[PDB]
Amino acid sequence: HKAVELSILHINDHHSYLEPHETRINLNGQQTKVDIGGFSAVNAKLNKLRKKYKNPLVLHAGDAITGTLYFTLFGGSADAAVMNAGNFHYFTLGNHEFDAGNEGLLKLLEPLKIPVLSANVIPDKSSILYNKWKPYDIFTVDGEKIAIIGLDTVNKTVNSSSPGKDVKFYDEIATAQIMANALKQQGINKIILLSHAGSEKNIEIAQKVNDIDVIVTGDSHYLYGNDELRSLKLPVIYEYPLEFKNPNGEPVFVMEGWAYSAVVGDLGVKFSPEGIASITRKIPHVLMSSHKLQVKNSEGKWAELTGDERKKALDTLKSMKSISLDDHDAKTDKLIAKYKSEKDRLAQEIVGVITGSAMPGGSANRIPNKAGSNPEGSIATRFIAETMYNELKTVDLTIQNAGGVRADILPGNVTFNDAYTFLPFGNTLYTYKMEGSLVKQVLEDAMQFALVDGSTGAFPYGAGIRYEANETPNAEGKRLVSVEVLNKTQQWEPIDDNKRYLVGTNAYVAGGKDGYKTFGKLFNDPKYEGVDTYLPDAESFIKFMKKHPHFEAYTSSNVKFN
């Protein structure tokens, strides 16, 4: 065994953020709007750093895809192209990789030339994903063997993404230890884990599992930082590398690179002959533009700095080692110019007009009456539900999960791109015939998942149904105070547990995802006459808008949540 030094460069969770995005910092004492990220800055910085450092190891810790129109419109081909241009050594699968099913994942993997690793996600032989990735790789540096293992988060993928049933998932901690243990007898004492299990689970692995030296993290989107970054009031969660001792007393380093192509992590690691890691360099590079520097003027208006105030702002950023200004890569610039111009072209198309008041939607408004939300919660989800109700003509009632609607819906023109921003998942519409008591329970299941067990995106809003609920469950464990269904006489009347209703919803929750346990029990059980309408979600919405000139926005969500 010999000692070796590695230069780890990594990103994670870029989520199809190919362009820079806006963030706020505290610079020279003032809240300042700047632009950060974009894949051009990422590839440029990776290219420069890798050429400067010995033994570069370039990693992407997962969730390359989903989150912007660059995914929705181009099905992952845009992301594959920019990642190829980055010449990453390895990519691990995240949870959102499965958001569009095995088919969706395949469309990313076909054009991707980066080796893919995932040890706890294993496709059956009949899967279209069979032989598309390996559990680990071994590469050699200066004579010595180093192993790298891939790992994915399980529950969030299985419960809230859409992996095919022919893809099997295994416990994160056990997989990490079994993999690492097996690698030892191949003469290996230097082991990297490229893990989308999230910071919480990766920290648990560092504390409970032996033989793993560095855990490059994805899924939690945490900025790991330093005093420089803290001085700018960036959202620093942890120091960049956390250092733990495993049960054998060996150091384990854990780190993430924020998200949305904002950061390139830069960790220089020295391994002793016996495989004990130590840190030689540690820099989270925040990728920032120098072009946007806006501060509120004396009137309260965001205005670009000018004159010497601007010079001072720029000069301060230049003085920081963890800030990287105006990186850009020509090859990546061209790729992004191509897709961006096609995206802009598509947005030229107006599909309709909404009048009136803005309809709150997106993450912050998923649950009514919470901090960050508003008293009605996701009116935009109620609106989408009304849209499904109308185009499913014969239905008594529709339910849509708040996570299925990705933004506020504002008055004015609605573009083709807006439709695919609100509804990016490509679900078809689905219907069941089910009794009133079952409708009540599916609402309970969804709220339990949204409020306790899983994702806020589960929170349910409906059309032709309205309800009141409390955060705090009561005696018999229930949250529902009352539910009413619209008599299609046009009068609202209490739901009765024993009548059979035709219920419309999207195919995602229809399969039991997002904790819609009842729906999942009904699925593939003739007794409930489930039917895939094959009507695509966004296409159906565009049709709705074309058939409803000047649609008046809703001002309530059909949910009263205490």
Q: Which of residues 190-229 bind Zn ion (CB under 5 A)?
A: 219
CB of 63 to its own copies, least distance (A): 23
Alpha helices in 121-193 (DSSP H): 155-160, 172-184
Residue 343 and residue 328: Cα distance in Å, rounded? 21
Beta carbons within 10 angstroms of residue 536's beta carbon: 16
Q: How far is CA 236 from CA 49, 223, 229, 286, in A?
A: 23, 5, 7, 12
Number of residues that bind Zn ion (CB under 5 A): 5
Among 16, 23, 160, 332, binds ligand A12 (CB under 6 A): 160
- Does the footprint of ligand A12 cover residue 175 (CB under 6 A)? no
CB of 216 to ligand A12, least distance (A): 19
- Does the footprint of ligand A12 cover residue 99 (CB under 6 A)? yes
CB of 208 to its own copies, least distance (A): 9
Beta carbons within 10 angstroms of residue 308's beta carbon: 9
Query: Of ligand A12, its own copies, Zn ion, none, which one does residue 365 interact with (CB within 5 to 8 Å by kind)?
Result: none
CB of 431 to Zn ion, least distance (A): 15
Torsion of CA 76, 81, 82, 87, to 10 degrees: 120
Place of tokens 């009133």: 436
CB of 506 to ligand A12, least distance (A): 5
Angle at the Cα of 247 from the Cα atoms of 245 and 248, rounded to 5 degrees = 85
Q: Which of residues 492-511 bind its own copies (CB under 8 A)?
A: none
- Does the footprint of ligand A12 cover residue 76 (CB under 6 A)? no
Number of residues that bind ligand A12 (CB under 6 A): 15
CB of 247 to its own copies, least distance (A): 5
How is residue 100 annotated by DSSP? Answer: T
Kind plus residue range of the DSSP H or E element containing 307: helix 307-318
Question: Is 339 buried (19+), middle (13-18) or exposed (0-12) by CB count in 10 A?
Answer: buried
Q: Which stretch binds Zn ion (CB under 5 A): 22-30, 56-64, 84-92, 281-289?
A: 56-64
Residue 520's nearest CA partner among 430, 402, 393 is 430
Residue 66, Cα to own-chain centre: how many angstroms? 7
Q: Which of residues 222-281 bind its own copies (CB under 8 A)?
A: 247-249
How is residue 452 annotated by DSSP? Answer: I
Strand pairing report for 236-239 and 223-225: parallel
Query: Of ligand A12, Zn ion, its own copies, none, which one does residue 210 interact with (CB within 5 to 8 Å by kind)?
Result: its own copies
Q: Which of residues 97-136 bind its own copies (CB under 8 A)?
A: 119-120, 122, 124-126, 134-136
Instruction: Point out which residues bind ligand A12 (CB under 6 A).
Output: 67, 99, 160, 162, 401, 403-404, 425, 427, 455, 457-458, 506, 508, 514
| Residues contributing to the site for its own copies (CB under 8 A) | 119-120, 122, 124-126, 134-136, 168, 170-171, 174-175, 177-179, 181-182, 185, 210, 247-249
